Amino acid sequence: SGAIYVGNYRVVNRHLATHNDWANLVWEDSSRDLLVSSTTAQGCDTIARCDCQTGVYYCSSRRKHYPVSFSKPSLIFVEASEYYPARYQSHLMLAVGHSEPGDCGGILRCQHGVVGIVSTGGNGLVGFADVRDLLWLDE
Ligand SMILES: NC(=O)[C@H]1CCCN(C(=O)Cc2cccc3c2OCO3)C1
Ligand SMILES: [Zn+2]
């Protein structure tokens, strides 16, 4: 579990979105596993606007933060689930690191701010849904 709170927005994994998220829906994309909902309270997370390939992510299955090198956001493969069939997820970045299903929602950050959230993993890899291209989250 986990979310990003920036301004009047909440960014979560689409497969983990609640009834409230869908009742206050701003934008969602199954291909990116992202959903953005509106909030009453103001969020203070800073979104990074950069091309960093290094950062630190929170791993809830270990109660620890880990430093990682990660790939550039690209179209990558994802096995089915009670959420989605086999497909390419777009805007996805991979790193070598520990991850378990409940780790989805953990934030990845660089020196410039929030980069993305955990969205996939397995076999010693962890995948993050990039949010740095969503310029509208700030205005
Ligand atoms: N975005 C998707 O289509 C995902 C939806 C939930 C299932 N999924 C996973 O990757 C599950 C998983 C297994 C093992 C380590 C994991 C992990 O998730 C975080 O790290 C795919
Ligand atoms: Zn950065």
Q: What's the resolution in A?
A: 1.5
Here the tokens at position 85 are: 């069939």
Do 52 and 36 belong to one domain?
A: no
The annotation status of 110 as a binding-site residue, yes or no, is: yes
The structure's method of determination equals X-ray
21 and 63 both lie in a single domain: no
Say which residues have a Cβ less than 8 Å from residue 123's Cβ, sequence separation at least 6.
none
Task: Of 3, 116, 14, give the one whose Cα is nearest residue 56.
Answer: 116
Q: Are residues 19 and 60 located together in one domain of the fold? A: no
Active-site residue identified among 15, 29, 45, 98: 15
What is the b/e burial string over 35-44, where b = at least 16 CB atoms within 10 angstroms of the residue's CB?
A: bbbebeeebe
52 is in an annotated binding site: yes
In sequence order, the β-bridge partners of residue 6 are 9, 44
Domain span holding position 100 = 45-139
Q: Tell me if 81 CB under 6 Å of ligand 1.
A: yes
Q: Would residue 104 show up in a list of annotated catalytic residues for this protein?
A: yes
Catalytic (active site) residue 51? no
